[PDB]
Amino acid sequence: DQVDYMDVSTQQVVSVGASLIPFLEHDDANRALMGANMQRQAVPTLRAD
Amino acid sequence: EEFDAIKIALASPDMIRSWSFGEVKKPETINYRTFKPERDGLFCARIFGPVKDYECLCGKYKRLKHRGVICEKCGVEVTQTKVRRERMGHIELASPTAHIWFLKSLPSRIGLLLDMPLRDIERVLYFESYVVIEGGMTNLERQQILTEEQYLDALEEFGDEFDAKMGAEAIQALLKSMDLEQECEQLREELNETNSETKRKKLTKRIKLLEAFVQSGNKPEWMILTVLPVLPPDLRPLVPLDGGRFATSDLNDLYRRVINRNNRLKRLLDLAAPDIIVRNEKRMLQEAVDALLDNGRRGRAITGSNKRPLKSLADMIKGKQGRFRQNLLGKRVDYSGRSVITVGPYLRLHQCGLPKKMALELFKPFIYGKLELRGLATTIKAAKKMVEREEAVVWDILDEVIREHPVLLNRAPTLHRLGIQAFEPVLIEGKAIQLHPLVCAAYNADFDGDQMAVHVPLTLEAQLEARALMMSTNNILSPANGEPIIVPSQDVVLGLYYMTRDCVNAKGEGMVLTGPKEAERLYRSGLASLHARVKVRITEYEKDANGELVAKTSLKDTTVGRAILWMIVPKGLPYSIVNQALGKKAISKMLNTCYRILGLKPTVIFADQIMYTGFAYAARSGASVGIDDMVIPEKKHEIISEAEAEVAEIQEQFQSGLVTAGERYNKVIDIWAAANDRVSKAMMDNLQTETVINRDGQEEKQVSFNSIYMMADSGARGSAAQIRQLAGMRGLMAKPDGSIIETPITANFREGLNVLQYFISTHGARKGLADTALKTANSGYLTRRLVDVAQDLVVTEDDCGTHEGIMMTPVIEGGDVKEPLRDRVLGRVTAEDVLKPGTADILVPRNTLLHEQWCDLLEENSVDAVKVRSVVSCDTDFGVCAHCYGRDLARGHIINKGEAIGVIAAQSIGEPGTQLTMRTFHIGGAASRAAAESSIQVKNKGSIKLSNVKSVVNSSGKLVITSRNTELKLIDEFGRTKESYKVPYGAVLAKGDGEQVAGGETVANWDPHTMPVITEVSGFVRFTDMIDGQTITRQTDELTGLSSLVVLDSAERTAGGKDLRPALKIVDAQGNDVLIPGTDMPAQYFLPGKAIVQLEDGVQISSGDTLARIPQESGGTKDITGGLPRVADLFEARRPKEPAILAEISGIVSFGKETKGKRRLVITPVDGSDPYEEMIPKWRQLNVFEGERVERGDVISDGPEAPHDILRLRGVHAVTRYIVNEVQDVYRLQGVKINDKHIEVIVRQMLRKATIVNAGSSDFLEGEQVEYSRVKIANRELEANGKVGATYSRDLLGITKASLATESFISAASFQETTRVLTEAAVAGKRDELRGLKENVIVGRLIPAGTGYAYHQDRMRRRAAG
DNA sequence: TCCGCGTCAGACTCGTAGGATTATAGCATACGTGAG
DNA sequence: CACGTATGCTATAATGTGAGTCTGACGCGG
């Protein structure tokens, strides 16, 4: 009866970059930060897989 | 050129003219069309020199034939263009201009000289007001300011016979008229008559200034500039960019400002302009010169084009970025390269993979050279083209040059000396540098993209210094601790662990082999496992009394695996070394053992062998990291629901009334901290063993071969702390403030945090990451302060022949001996023939290096205390003796004379801080502290020994302690100290002094949260000065109404209560004061900030009761963030807010005066008739009572001691040991091993200077501060010859000031505060003879240390003749 | 002793970008040096 | 003598200005 509202998605806390990390739930926040940071450094290959 | 010293002094107007080669009259730079220098402009060729080599401007004389031929037509000398970087010019200023550095730089020289405040001088300079220069009529005296209206009054009445002027002309006249001699005598006469304490300093300082001014031969007028020097053109260049545009220095904009306004001033003087306009122009001229010298000091700096302030002269010297730190104390370097690093597991310890193309380029001159000696290259340009074409024969020549040629590898940051190492290079195809694994530790190298600098030592000398001193193989031990830095890790560890570790039966349990060869063949054949018990016959080789090795053959139960590792193990070592399951910790000991028994080459070979076998078996095994590895305890949910309803019950009790925010914070943190340990220990029992393997018939228990458990137990990678977060519970995380979040993370990484647990994790994570970026800065700033202070310290002598040293006892704190005496005195020169108990035969000699063998003898006899020779007590002037220092911990033998000890000390103290900043922070998330410091339980039976303790017996029957410093010890039978235990104040002891307790008994219980105020006397309780709202606060309850009192401190307190000390006073039934047993003191206990008293006034107390609970919020987290500021505070000698009081002079004391409650402790010694009287706070309670014969430095108050007071009363070894222990407390809390001798070096540098009383035969008089070495030199010649004896007193300097107090001004300038250092040196006319290292590095010379010590000592003896 | 002032704050790496911003009067005599 | 560079004078009256703020710490001097 006290509850007024609820989170729309489980994703809303996280940004775009971090949303692309699969098992984020099992990853330390520091390592996850650098992961989201290195995805931005990824050079596209000849065959996009 | 080769010179002896450098001196700095004020520039005379005429001196400035000497350097100048002409007056630049015009702002003209160059001609827009012919981009050549304009007439008498800023780039004038007529003044600074020719633009092109041996060519005049108008072009009449060309070629090297024309030499010094000044062209008559244009007026340009035919010399090299180089001259335009060296020739200076000048500017004729219309008005005299004050030099900002002597005006604004604090304290200031012009102000201190005239004894005239800055404000007065400035009013004069900006032409607001006149100043009197001299009036024969005392009507107006000297230096008296007159406003515009004040000047009109005296001008009519007296006029003429009184001289008062405005602007820099006035101040220059005032400086010219001032007689340095006469004022010196007048000031000496003032000090003779009435020397007031604080103004004696200031008068003595102006006397020192006047004396120093006359001795320097500087003239005060010269502080005001009449001629202004101009920097040579090439040092403020106008060059064309590719785009056709030009680019120029900001000095050109500032010079043009000055010239325009100066020339306009000449004009307005020629034109006889009205005075208001002349004044404005003189203001603007001084503004422009002050902007040119030091922009930003004179207020708002002049912004150029972007808005950024123009970079002025001083700005190019001053900043870190100036010229000292950037271009002179370090530079960019030829024959330098870099690239990504990658592993070279195939390499030997002394080798590194160097890319082909990289090495081709670095050794270009060496190739050119061999190419011409083989006659393959006709000349250098053909050799260059052969290299450009990269011809096949060139590769073969390059291979020949690199052979036996060492290359330096460097990694940023270079924290300690092993951050540079030499290797023999191995040419490799590919662009990445290959690094040997075992040195990755010293570089802190991990291959996820780190890069390294390569440097080529060119000279034969540099090659030899690289191969002998800097080689990887030769730098095995660290400069800080004696432990080795080079050691196998990761795979090399995993492989050897897999080999040694044993399993149940397996293939071929209980088999008999004939040596390790049979074992290996069996394992390779596939009939035996590596972890299977098998009886083998190994033949170990043990060293005898001489150099001969004795051979011993015996049967010992072992695994196959360990037998095969024995094959790698050199003869001399015991088989017991390989017989355990090996981890990284055991392998490090293995290589150290081998080094000290067998020597360097065998350990080198053995190290390589360990690496090869380790990696080869690492791939043979096949360890993996599965998700099933991290097994969660079945009993987590129970522990957590229990812990969770518990914390819930305390939160509900919070609204009730037994709880402050601090108390509940402590209680919740304690509950979760114990829960975390519980779940972790559940996981580790369930994981570490919980291996049900059926032995040969029935079931057995043995260690688990779970992958993550093996990784943790071997010490290969993760610790138990990390695996807690994986498989157990993540725990309580700590905010960026350091205060810990009340809600812990119940989950682990295998379980998956949920959105809320992950979000809560973020705080700790990011504070960790921000910590690495930000704190490494203050860490690094401490490294640099330390280095500057201990640069000069070098081993100068072999033996000073001193007996003096500091008594080192074993660090036995917290039951388990923290640091053994043997290790603490391992590698030190023993002082004073210290034998065994029975004094009738010497056991140990005097000057003898404490080797591991001597140390092992010490342990059989169980010596507790040893006077050892230390750096601090060494007599050597201008350095320290090899014996006072002891072993070079990095070499493993006696230190070499000439070694730069100070640098190594500063680096080794600095490194751990800087490394522990980034390291613990990125790696951990949460804080795993454990606060449950309630009960002391004793581990081994013995009798209770209480030293320093004053306790009162309470009505319970129990001994309740009321001492501040209390040390419970555990004595055995023989009577040695083995366990220690710091009992606090407010403690209940189970048993009293000298009583027997059994193993596992609790001997004292105390509350950790709340330090109670415990009363000695019994009676009724009285509220003194405890006015509600003024000093305390009142808070009331329901139904009946329980009020509770909280003592508001002066922070929250009103102006009314400020002077009142609030205190619970003990009165009896009559309502008279109860006395404290045996003294005239009435009982009264002064309550500090927020002392929460429950029980309201008039309540009968018994003795030994808790009056008041002051809350003790310990929001501290266990990290270096909080430790390092304490380290910096000790090194810089930062006096605390409440210094500890100590006996000043020995003798017999009674009390005199009191200010309300403030004690005025009166010492009246026995022999020394003069008293010493101290004001003391009322609330600070004394350890001493009344008439006792206390000696110098007996502890009176409770509170932290100032290192100053320790040095000043007890002396050197006292204060040195205080610093060493207080610093080491912090570093030891973080698991950092630094030898005391390094800290001792820096304390020696702290105690460099000494103040002097009285005169000798030199110029001492009252209170000059001179260095200790130099006054000792004087005292040695004085004692032999006689003359006036001089009393001295050593002064402590904290690091920053100690580095600025060095008599080298080049070192002082390079360190910090450069503007101020150069003004004080320039005014003193100081002469730097270049003795220190920084000084010689700046002039680009040989260091007076290491290799350079030989050459440098040869120059010092060339000073005696020729 | 209270409060404006002024000197402090890790080490290397690379990748960079922008020239942007601004307005001035127009014409005759004088001052000075260079080309034919 | 031409070319480049500079100093000259203009006559309605007009005559008083004008960025970014916030670190935290410590050690002297007034």
Ligand SMILES: Nc1ccn([C@@H]2O[C@H](COP(=O)(O)OP(=O)(O)OP(=O)(O)O)[C@@H](O)[C@H]2O)c(=O)n1
């Ligand atoms: N801003 C930084 C980052 C890194 N380093 C140095 O480089 C080392 C390695 O950095 P990094 O590779 O990020 O850390 P590791 O502890 O090796 O962890 P990982 O590579 O697994 O992330 C740091 O410990 C530190 O000595 C530094 O001085 N300054």
Ligand SMILES: [Mg+2]
């Ligand atoms: Mg790295």
Ligand SMILES: [Zn+2]
């Ligand atoms: Zn010429």
